Amino acid sequence: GGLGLIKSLAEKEKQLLERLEAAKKEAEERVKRAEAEAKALLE
Amino acid sequence: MIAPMEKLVLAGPKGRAKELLQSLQQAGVVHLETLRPEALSAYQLSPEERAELRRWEAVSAGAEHTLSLLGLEAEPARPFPEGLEAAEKALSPIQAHAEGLTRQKQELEEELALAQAYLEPLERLAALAHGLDKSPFLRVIPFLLTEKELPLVEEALRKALEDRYLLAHEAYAGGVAALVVVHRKEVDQAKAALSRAGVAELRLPGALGELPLSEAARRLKERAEAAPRELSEVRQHLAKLARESASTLQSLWTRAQDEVARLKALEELASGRFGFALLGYVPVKAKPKVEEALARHKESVVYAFEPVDEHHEADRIPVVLDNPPWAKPFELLVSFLNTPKYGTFDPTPVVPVFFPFWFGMIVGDIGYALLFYLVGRWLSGYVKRNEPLVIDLFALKLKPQVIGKLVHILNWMVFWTVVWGVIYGEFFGTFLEHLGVFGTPEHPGLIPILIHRIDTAKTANLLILLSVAFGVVLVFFGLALRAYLGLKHRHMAHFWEGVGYLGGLVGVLALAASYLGNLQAGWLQGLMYLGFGVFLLAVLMSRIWLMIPEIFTQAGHILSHIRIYAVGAAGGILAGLLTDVGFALAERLGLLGVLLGLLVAGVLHLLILLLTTLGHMLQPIRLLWVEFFTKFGFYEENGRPYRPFKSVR
Numbered sequence: 039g040g041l042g043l044i045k046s047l048a049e050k051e052k053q054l055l056e057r058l059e060a061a062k063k064e065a066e067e068r069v070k071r072a073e074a075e076a077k078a079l080l081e
Numbered sequence: 082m083i084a085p086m087e088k089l090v091l092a093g094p095k096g097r098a099k100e101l102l103q104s105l106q107q108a109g110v111v112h113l114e115t116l117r118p119e120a121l122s123a124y125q126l127s128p129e130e131r132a133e134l135r136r137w138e139a140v141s142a143g144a145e146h147t148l149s150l151l152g153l154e155a156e157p158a159r160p161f162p163e164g165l166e167a168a169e170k171a172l173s174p175i176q177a178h179a180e181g182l183t184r185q186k187q188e189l190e191e192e193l194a195l196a197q198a199y200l201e202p203l204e205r206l207a208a209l210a211h212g213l214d215k216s217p218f219l220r221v222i223p224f225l226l227t228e229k230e231l232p233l234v235e236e237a238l239r240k241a242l243e244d245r246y247l248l249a250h251e252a253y254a255g256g257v258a259a260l261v262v263v264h265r266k267e268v269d270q271a272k273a274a275l276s277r278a279g280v281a282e283l284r285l286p287g288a289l290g291e292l293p294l295s296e297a298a299r300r301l302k303e304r305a306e307a308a309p310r311e312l313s314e315v316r317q318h319l320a321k322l323a324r325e326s327a328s329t330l331q332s333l334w335t336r337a338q339d340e341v342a343r344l345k346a347l348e349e350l351a352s353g354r355f356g357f358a359l360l361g362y363v364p365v366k367a368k369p370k371v372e373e374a375l376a377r378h379k380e381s382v383v384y385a386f387e388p389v390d391e392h393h394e395a396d397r398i399p400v401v402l403d404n405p406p407w408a409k410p411f412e413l414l415v416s417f418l419n420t421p422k423y424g425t426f427d428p429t430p431v432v433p434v435f436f437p438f439w440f441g442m443i444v445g446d447i448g449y450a451l452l453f454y455l456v457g458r459w460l461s462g463y464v465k466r467n468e469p470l471v472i473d474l475f476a477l478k479l480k481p482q483v484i485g486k487l488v489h490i491l492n493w494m495v496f497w498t499v500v501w502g503v504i505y506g507e508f509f510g511t512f513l514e515h516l517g518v519f520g521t522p523e524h525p526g527l528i529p530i531l532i533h534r535i536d537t538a539k540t541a542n543l544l545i546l547l548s549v550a551f552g553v554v555l556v557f558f559g560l561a562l563r564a565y566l567g568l569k570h571r572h573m574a575h576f577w578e579g580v581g582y583l584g585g586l587v588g589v590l591a592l593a594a595s596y597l598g599n600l601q602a603g604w605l606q607g608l609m610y611l612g613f614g615v616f617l618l619a620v621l622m623s624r625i626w627l628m629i630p631e632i633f634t635q636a637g638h639i640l641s642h643i644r645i646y647a648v649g650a651a652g653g654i655l656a657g658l659l660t661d662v663g664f665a666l667a668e669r670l671g672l673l674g675v676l677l678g679l680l681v682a683g684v685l686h687l688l689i690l691l692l693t694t695l696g697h698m699l700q701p702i703r704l705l706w707v708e709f710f711t712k713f714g715f716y717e718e719n720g721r722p723y724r725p726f727k728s729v730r
Binding site: 039 | 353357
């Protein structure tokens with residue numbers, strides 16, 4: 039019941055932390071791809 | 082009875098949790114619970130929220146200090162809903178005016194006291210010092226001193242120059258103003274020698290002992306002339322400021338108490354990492370209003386409304402009384418005891434059944450019951466005045482609901498009191514001496530009374546048997562309740578203990594009535610044998626060495642019920658002896674000073690009533706709390722209290 043609600047809020051925190059870390063990793067990958075494309079444009 | 086005290090669990094986001102905290106503070110029907118451990122955060126809200134809470138707490142503390150300086154009392158009322166800075170700006174004008182007034186009036190009173198302390202003597206000294214006030218050849222040591230030790234100071238004056246040192250006490254001889262004037266350095270040595278002989282130059286505080294004595298006397302005369310009207314106007318201004326600002330101050334104080342309570346309640350939460358969850362306890366009879374408030378929330382959020390834990394360790398679960406409206410006033414007397422084990426039976430209805438009957442059988446004076454009804458009428462008039470019952474003699478301001486419960490208990494006890502006083506046949510003590518409204522064989526004037534109350538040889542055995550039987554039935558009910566609680570809680574130790582107590586008590590009562598009472602112990606021989614066998618069998622089923630001392634303690638607790646009959650008979654015999662001696666020395670000695678002798682006898686009877694009837698009413702309740710509570714335990718961890726949010730208004 040309420041302990042399941044507490045663990046559900048904790049698992050929602052875990053899922054949102056996983057989503058934020060994956061968003062940061064994909065953003066770093068997209069920034070690296072943009073840097074490679076800009077290096078290609080400069081070359 | 083013990084309530085259900087259902088447990089509630091709530092969860093959601095954070096701002097919705099703050100709004101629901103405001104809701105459950107407005108709907109303060111659930112006591113709080115931490116439940117921090119399993120996968121939760123601490124819900125440390127904010128240091129900015131901590132600073133706003135410190136601002137609100139400082140506002141409430143300053144409001145309480147300003148109410149104390151205003152002299153008014155801090156009463157909870159309807160709150161003043163506004164911002165914290167606006168409430169601070171409103172309070173600080175009033176707080177600054179109150180601080181300035183409390184400084185100025187106290188300073189004016191202290192200035193009036195210091196001016197009147199040395200008003201006339203400094204005036205006489207400045208009158209005598211009309212030649213050398215600041216003349217550059219002589220100092221002035223004036224001493225408002227004691228009686229005629231002026232020769233002892235004249236010894237030091239002769240130690241100074243004799244054709245100099247004008248040193249005498251002129252007038253105002255309460256402090257004889259021995260002023261001395263000689264020189265600068267010679268007068269310094271002379272003042273040292275005079276202080277060695279006992280003298281002191283008048284060094285007062287402020288400016289009266291810090292300026293020239295003529296200007297000091299003029300300023301002291303101006304202060305003494307002005308300080309009375311200044312203190313009166315300051316008291317009038319303070320009274321008008323209190324009468325014009327205490328309502329807004331109390332509304333702001335109630336709102337600040339509400340906001341500070343909400344701030345303190347926000348600290349006790351448990352977060353869920355941009356989520357929040359909490360546990361609490363609310364009554365199942367209050368589940369409807371709590372569910373209406375939960376639907377009144379912004380989401381109707383997930384409220385796991387489970388019941389409390391069962392009789393195995395319901396200790397964090399709170400407790401609350403479940404009594405009838407007739408049984409509602411007994412909860413006030415049961416509040417002297419602690420809360421229950423949440424599965425322990427509240428015997429407060431049996432308390433209102435038995436202690437009213439025992440107090441009726443104890444208090445059987447019709448004059449005492451008439452005084453009780455008259456005091457109930459006076460307290461009912463005071464409750465019609467609807468003030469809190471404030472006895473500054475007792476220093477107790479009580480709720481008028483407590484006074485109404487006391488009046489209802491007084492009526493419910495006075496019914497049985499008048500009933501047993503008719504059973505005792507006692508009218509204002511003993512009015513049957515003059516007019517026999519009861520019927521005795523010695524003096525038949527009317528129909529008979531049940532209790533003779535002067536004759537006891539027929540009454541002692543029956544009164545002792547009834548007082549034994551009431552306590553025995555109470556002890557049997559207590560042992561049965563202990564065994565039933567051990568069965569319901571699955572505490573087979575307590576169940577076997579109550580069973581062995583009942584078996585040993587039955588065997589001991591059978592053996593006592595057989596051996597010590599009459600003959601024919603044939604029906605009781607196997608009774609005592611089976612009772613001792615059951616006691617030994619449940620002792621082996623306990624094996625805890627709960628020895629014969631515990632059984633003898635229960636036996637003495639059962640036997641203590643005869644003291645109620647003893648105390649009732651003692652109070653009746655004392656009132657009868659007082660009324661009989663008064664009637665004898667009044668009518669039988671003279672039959673014309675009957676009014677003064679009756680007044681003296683009534684005053685002595687009222688003094689004896691004020692001395693003894695309170696203890697007579699308390700010792701039935703004392704024996705009831707000693708017997709019925711302890712027979713059911715009632716000292717086992719005291720449970721938890723139903724402590725929800727107040728919202729006192």
